[PDB]
Design a protein around this nucleic acid. Structure first.
Ligand SMILES: Nc1ncnc2c1ncn2[C@@H]1O[C@@H]2COP(=O)(O)O[C@H]2[C@H]1O
Ligand SMILES: Nc1ncnc2c1ncn2[C@@H]1O[C@@H]2COP(=O)(O)O[C@H]2[C@H]1O
Ligand SMILES: Nc1ncnc2c1ncn2[C@@H]1O[C@@H]2COP(=O)(O)O[C@H]2[C@H]1O
Ligand SMILES: Nc1ncnc2c1ncn2[C@@H]1O[C@@H]2COP(=O)(O)O[C@H]2[C@H]1O
Lengths: 203, 200
DNA sequence: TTCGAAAAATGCGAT
DNA sequence: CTAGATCGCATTTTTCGAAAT
DNA sequence: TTTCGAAAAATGCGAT
DNA sequence: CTAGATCGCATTTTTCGAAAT
């Protein structure tokens, strides 16, 4: 932390959420902004039957609930769920705008994050439009294997995730994921036992 | 609109005829665009050349903003003119200088990125949750309620090819063709050539 | 580090 | 022709809270 | 400112 | 099973720019 973060937080209300809890409900009126002090969350949307699609994972340093800031009468566009325990700062849009008046760098930071999220989401549209499930899963496994929470392994990198969650990322049933992971292992591209998956030749 | 006039006085104005390329995907991003007149399409292509439309943008919209917040970024997509366009262009360097004297310019830009993220997230949901028939129906209906839609005694009228609908929903032109025939069979639309009447 | 539920995840497979 | 979604249960595998170290 | 005949672009095939 | 992608071309629309009154 530094004097700027402390200055910012002194204008916020800090709350702690346990793993699996819901921070933002899709459809509710948006009047506040959040800043992740510690922890990680998953951004998701769902269909009429409850099927879920994960749009993104966010971490400490990331703002959340920002899309309603620029125009009143807006509703939350997605659900945000705590992936681990989280410490989150909350502030009304009304007061956040006053803070921008005294220190506009805060808007620059928020804007940069939205820009990155738009590039990532546009790429997802492409993957879904141009790639079959095998290609989407293959790319998703390589991407996770290169994140900072991924563990090293003599044959490449190791990650821990369920077939169901992979299905929520790539847009397919958990059964299809399971059948493809076995084919990938037969082709000796990976090794998977339980939630532990080893991605080979990532190095 | 003092700021708007102030902003434009620092830009270079260019014109692009319909179908021309304003932004090439993969090239280095160093300049920001602002549409003064006309409309464009933002699209991505696969290795085989198939295309997918991410969005249509119109007068008042910024373009090429994604490479501004990080160094060494490349254009994330192609931008092609749909109609003849009049566009204001300014370097990232100079734009940053304008942000300093009046950060409200960044506010208007951020507001558009916020809306584009909401829209693109909705598109992800549609691609993952709806079959082609459902995606085509929603698209026909949204197009029919846009300002450029024509009045018709049976509802609203639009003009578009089966190939373009295919680039919007992510399916082959042949599939769009078969689905439009089935939707006509259900009396939801009437299609002759590029002209489609959405009953209402 | 440990151990026994509790609860979560997984395999099924011809249409 | 090629890809995938389904569905009800019985089995695995993982998580969790408190003892044991 | 209407009309018209190419080029160009778009569409149907439809069992596999 | 249900949903969609494919391919080689002849045929059906659209788009255009030049010619007229
Ligand atoms: N097209 C899709 N088909 C099936 N499940 C999907 C799809 N898109 C997203 N999902 C979600 O991904 C999840 C993967 O595990 P489940 O089969 O339990 O439930 C699935 C849905 O919630
Ligand atoms: N595509 C996305 N990528 C990343 N974060 C998103 C995306 N869509 C929505 N969000 C976040 O989820 C939040 C849900 O509530 P808001 O709409 O207020 O603000 C949204 C963003 O912070
Ligand atoms: N899954 C897809 N299958 C086919 N075409 C697609 C797909 N996704 C995007 N497209 C594009 O949309 C276009 C629709 O018409 P075409 O079949 O001529 O060419 C198609 C591609 O350029
Ligand atoms: N999902 C999207 N919705 C709207 N506009 C987009 C989207 N993705 C990219 N763009 C625009 O297309 C531009 C391509 O170049 P840039 O990446 O510089 O900036 C991008 C945005 O201005």
């Amino acid at each position: 932390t530094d004097p700027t973060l402390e200055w910012f937080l002194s204008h916020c209300h800090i709350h702690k959420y346990p793993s699996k809890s819901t921070l933002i409900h899709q459809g509710e009126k948006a009047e506040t902004l959040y800043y992740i002090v510690k922890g990680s969350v998953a951004v998701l949307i769902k269909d009429e039957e409850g099927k879920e699609m994960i749009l993104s994972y966010l971490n400490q340093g990331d703002f959340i609930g920002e899309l309603g800031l620029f125009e009143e009468g807006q509703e939350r566009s997605a659900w945000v769920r705590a992936k681990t325990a989280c410490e989150v700062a909350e502030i009304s849009y009304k007061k956040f705008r006053q803070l921008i008046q005294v220190n506009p760098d805060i808007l620059m930071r928020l804007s940069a994050q939205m820009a990155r999220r738009l590039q990532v989401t546009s790429e997802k549209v492409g993957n879904l439009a141009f790639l079959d499930v095998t290609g989407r899963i293959a790319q998703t496994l390589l991407n996770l294997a290169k994140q900072p929470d991924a563990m090293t392994h003599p044959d490449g990198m190791q990650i821990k995730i369920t077939r169901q969650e992979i299905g929520q990322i790539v847009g397919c049933s958990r059964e299809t994921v399971g059948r493809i992971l076995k084919m990938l292992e037969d082709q000796n591209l990976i090794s998977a036992h339980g939630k532990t998956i080893v991605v080979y030749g990532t190095r």
